[PDB]
Symmetry: C3
Amino acid sequence: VVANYENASMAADYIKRVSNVLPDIGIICGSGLGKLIEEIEERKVIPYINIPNFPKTTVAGHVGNLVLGSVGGRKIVAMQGRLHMYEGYSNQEIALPIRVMKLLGVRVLLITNLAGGINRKLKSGDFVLIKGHINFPGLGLNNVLVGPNQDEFGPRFPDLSNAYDRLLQQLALKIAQENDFQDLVHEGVYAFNGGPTYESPDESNMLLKLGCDVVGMSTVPEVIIACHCGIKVLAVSLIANNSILDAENDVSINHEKVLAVAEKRADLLQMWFKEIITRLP
Amino acid sequence: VVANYENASMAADYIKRVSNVLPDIGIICGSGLGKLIEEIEERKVIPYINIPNFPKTTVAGHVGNLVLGSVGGRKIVAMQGRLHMYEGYSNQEIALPIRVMKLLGVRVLLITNLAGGINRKLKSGDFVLIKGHINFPGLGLNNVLVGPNQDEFGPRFPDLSNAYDRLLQQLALKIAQENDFQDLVHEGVYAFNGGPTYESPDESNMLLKLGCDVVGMSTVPEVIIACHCGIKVLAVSLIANNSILDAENDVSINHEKVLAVAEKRADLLQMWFKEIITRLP
Amino acid sequence: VVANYENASMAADYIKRVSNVLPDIGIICGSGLGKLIEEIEERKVIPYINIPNFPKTTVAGHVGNLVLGSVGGRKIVAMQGRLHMYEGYSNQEIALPIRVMKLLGVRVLLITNLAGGINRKLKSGDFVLIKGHINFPGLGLNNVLVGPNQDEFGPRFPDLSNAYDRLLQQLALKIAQENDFQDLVHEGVYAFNGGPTYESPDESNMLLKLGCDVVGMSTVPEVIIACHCGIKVLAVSLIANNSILDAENDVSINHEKVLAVAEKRADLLQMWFKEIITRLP
Ligand SMILES: N#Cc1c(F)cccc1NCCc1ccccn1
Ligand SMILES: N#Cc1c(F)cccc1NCCc1ccccn1
Ligand SMILES: N#Cc1c(F)cccc1NCCc1ccccn1
């Protein structure tokens, strides 16, 4: 199924009938970082498998729902169970849910992820406001927009200079200052490692030379689809570890250690993003 | 359809019957840079859609013709409507038209493109003679030659050391000196960004570190197919902007600004390439 | 055919019945470096085409056998005719033979390849013990593990920090010292160029900046599948040429020159690896 205007419209039609919610904010949460979705008020849970033209996700399994409702007086739509390109989903399968968000009315997309730290200033448990990216799949002919252009959503050749909204970064930092956790909050450049292997120690060292501050396996495909169709983005990484220090000390990593860091910061991130949603212009 | 010997031959058979032209020069022109094709003498226009085994191009639409005739006393064949890998064409679809050129008799291929400037010496409106390249798709398992080798055209493992002919670069510079526009003409290394998004500001900064002078979304796939089968290449970029200056000043870009630069230099480029064709050994 | 548990088991069943050999060492040899396979004792030769669920290799042609038997008192299984991703094989086709090795009992995989030298200390005819890698296809969304995870073999997110066993590197160097050819043996970082074109002179210069010591078109896909499923690896490159010196002097390369270097070192490499096999703990 192509992520075109007709097919995105059929999915939006079904959602509108079932939920009665008209959202203007969308959220996509990282692994272990989705507790906010369980606190949406007057919520409606829609399994992907029920929605016309949504991508098939039964080979990977696990949760896959769209959740609509209210947070802080604001109408939102959330993806519960994010789609990652290392699972083998096509460009069209990744893009269709973001384009349905656009047709539903979404004007701002908030995204979190887990990432490895490259910059020597970053420690486990820190947050990084993403201000730009290095897209190795895009340079290498695996950009999420390779294929015919869907003209109703955006232009053939997008400019990504302003993909990460500066005012949303400033609001996020302001709220961290108000609650006295600004000492945890950095800004930086995100490198997209297609995955699913963690980057190797020699790859981490290369990324340090090339000006990257953090590395992860998500987020950039969704940012590009959002920017193409005029949706503003805030993206925040939670740092699991410092890859460069771990290479110097020959320390390993595994998904369990990553999820332990997510549990340690889950409740603070939930409170932060509730306030960002409440305060969005 | 595979870009093999049998299928390229069937296309060449059809073309030979309809045109009666035996070309020894091929040309592929960048966007907004194709006016020379409309001045080919005693010309024959063949829609791709009419030619056996040519790739299907109706999803993208717009012009798609092969044009044969004479320039400066020389027999040429032109692609009007270039095929780009960011549109989703396969390796086989890109390679088949170049291999038909080879079977028709082409010994020299001339190519222009629009590109972003990285080297601090480059300004909007400058020309760069391409002397080498950095092929991010090729390093990343999206090289145009991935697949079985077509032995009748070339070897399994090509050497690209001499893909950009030195004597053709010297002729191009000589003719610019004769007409007193050598102040516009540089040489440099071309980075292939698969596209279709312009490279991000942090990607431009990375490319400066890695020794790239210009960046674009075309040309390298065709150069590799030509080099594989023994066709000599001259490739020239027209610089739309300096990506590094625009990042320092937070200036945006869009396809309209690119095409305005092409219109500004179209007539000079047409005159330059007519003389290069006339003067080729 | 997916490289899953059921399909790998059917292939292992067939092999077990025909060979009666239970191997605990696997070997994959580079081009022109396979003479050891012809000296396996009490050997059994099984054409890939006869084995259930093995990948189809008739478009490329040439030899394709699994060979089982004894070396130095140890039970081994060899791939005669390696599968390379530049030929167009899928992730699933590359992974299935390594996963059959795992089900047969393989605990250690030994690999050789031919490679270009980047580090200024490397000369034609030198050996490099691989201690880490830079995987441009993996960064760029062409990692061999993209797709659903096969949980019976390994985890969704592997750590490659220890993919190249340190004790096996130390054994290999010890045996070179015993036979007084340690002056030929270096260690270094391997860059994976997807291929099939040799990397360009400007790509070689980029790789020098990024900390790479050698460059080649194989090995990293097999290493990742082995590490995922708990098989220890030793990988050794034979250096064909120094790419940086050849760029400074405008010297070309071709597959014939590569194979001449392999013939020059074939007999020494055969003797080295026989002793490594004999001495493995
Ligand atoms: N890519 C990525 C990534 C990620 F997506 C989430 C968390 C950490 C990541 N890299 C860590 C690299 C590393 C490898 C081995 C030991 C220590 N560190
Ligand atoms: N890739 C490519 C490219 C091209 F193919 C043609 C013309 C310009 C290109 N990059 C410009 C990068 C850039 C982004 C945002 C603002 C200014 N500059
Ligand atoms: N990639 C790779 C590679 C290889 F797989 C085996 C042997 C040599 C390799 N590069 C040599 C680069 C080069 C290009 C032109 C002239 C001299 N040198």
